[PDB]
Design a protein around this ligand. Structure first.
Ligand SMILES: Cc1cc2nc3c(=O)[nH]c(=O)nc-3n(C[C@H](O)[C@H](O)[C@H](O)COP(=O)(O)O)c2cc1C
Ligand SMILES: Cc1cc2nc3c(=O)[nH]c(=O)nc-3n(C[C@H](O)[C@H](O)[C@H](O)COP(=O)(O)O)c2cc1C
Lengths: 210, 205
């Protein structure tokens, strides 16, 4: 049955570009899926803690012989995988911070890669396939082909490789040049920033409709 | 002075921790009477920057939220450790085709206007330092290999640090899973090749 996992990872608060875009997508989804319920996760406000030496390798250690930190980490993996298993659609906000994904999203994927939960512990067959993963990526500069920052995005090409074991295949709507309006010497690029946002908003408005 | 940074979560199984303690020893040889600051991001990671604690550098010191002041204190202490150093030794494992989340957060704290770069000119303030990065991959990411372009740790770090003026130099140990992983037993030669060629490059420095 139709179920939305709405994940935010922006740390910008009221200045966030990704939060309005994921709220827009989520309301567009709820209207296209009128019996659909929604689970919300804000990794921005409430990040999941880093996997540490004490809590790592829960997936290879049997339950009976885990340290109390590994069992805590395993409980976190059971929760984040369950949320994705229940979903037919996942909407993730993905800012580019220091030319990579938010640390919170990297740890969220660390928890999601869990043998027997997200992939078969024996066949290694993906267990979270046949699901929609819509990723609303925001970035401060321009990273398109024939820009000077081409190849500086290590979030957008990473996420499909980080998730590729689970059968989740992210589909990207990218808004760029979002630093242009707050950045001296980017005043010629403010029209492009507005156009990039409007194009993303169009793609979000036409999603799930004929 | 040397900053020795570990980010392994693999404990006694770690390939990177021995390689970094090797560098620390070879450095304490070539630079005797030098001090060492040790950082274990693996055991004791710096917490994620959150909505409450973010944007400390672009918010005036007076009108900062209490948690932004906490994050700024962490940034001051992190940048200090790199400023005090002449050589930086960092262990960079590849976990889920990226860096450890611990290292991504560590770089987030390090990118701080007025500490690692001038708040106004944005001129790098941590340049003219040695940054040696002992990268450890489980698989093989070389030209033609099926996982070519799946490393989002090594090609990322120079881009993430570029505002500070640190330029990482990589010694890459790959295929470290080959000898403990069935179906990759035909790559244990290259695994032993990689680790010794890496300990070789560590020795000649
Ligand atoms: C801590 C931080 C680091 C950033 N690093 C980069 C960067 O490396 N490259 C870039 O193009 N923009 C960078 N930006 C700009 C963001 O990518 C941009 O504001 C984007 O809209 C973030 O999404 P959000 O508005 O939902 O937080 C950074 C912003 C912050 C707050
Ligand atoms: C949680 C985890 C995830 C890993 N993900 C990858 C991966 O995406 N690609 C890969 O080639 N090896 C992967 N490996 C293998 C490690 O990169 C390899 O073990 C390396 O030695 C890590 O350094 P360390 O032993 O110091 O922790 C992973 C290992 C762990 C524990």
């Amino acid at each position: 049955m139709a179920h939305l996992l709405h994940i935010d990872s922006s740390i910008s608060g009221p200045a966030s570009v990704s939060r309005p875009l994921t709220a827009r997508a989520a309301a567009n989804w709820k209207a296209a899926h009128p019996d659909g319920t929604v689970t919300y996760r804000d990794l921005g406000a409430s990040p999941l803690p880093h996997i540490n030496t004490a809590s790592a390798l829960a997936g290879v250690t049997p339950a009976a012989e885990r340290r109390p930190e590994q069992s805590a980490a395993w409980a976190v993996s059971e929760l984040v995988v369950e949320e994705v298993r229940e979903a037919t659609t996942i909407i993730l906000g993905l800012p580019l911070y220091n030319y990579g994904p938010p640390s919170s999203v990297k740890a969220w994927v660390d928890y999601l890669i869990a043998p027997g939960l997200s992939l078969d512990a024996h066949t290694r067959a993906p267990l979270l396939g046949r699901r929609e993963l819509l990723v609303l990526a925001t970035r401060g500069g321009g990273f398109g082909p024939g820009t000077p920052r081409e190849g500086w995005d290590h979030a957008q090409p990473w996420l499909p490789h980080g998730l590729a074991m689970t059968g989740l295949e992210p589909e990207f709507i990218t808004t760029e040049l979002t630093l242009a309006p707050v950045t001296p010497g980017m005043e010629h690029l403010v029209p492009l920033a507005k156009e990039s946002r409007a194009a993303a908003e169009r793609a979000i408005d036409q999603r799930w409709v004929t």
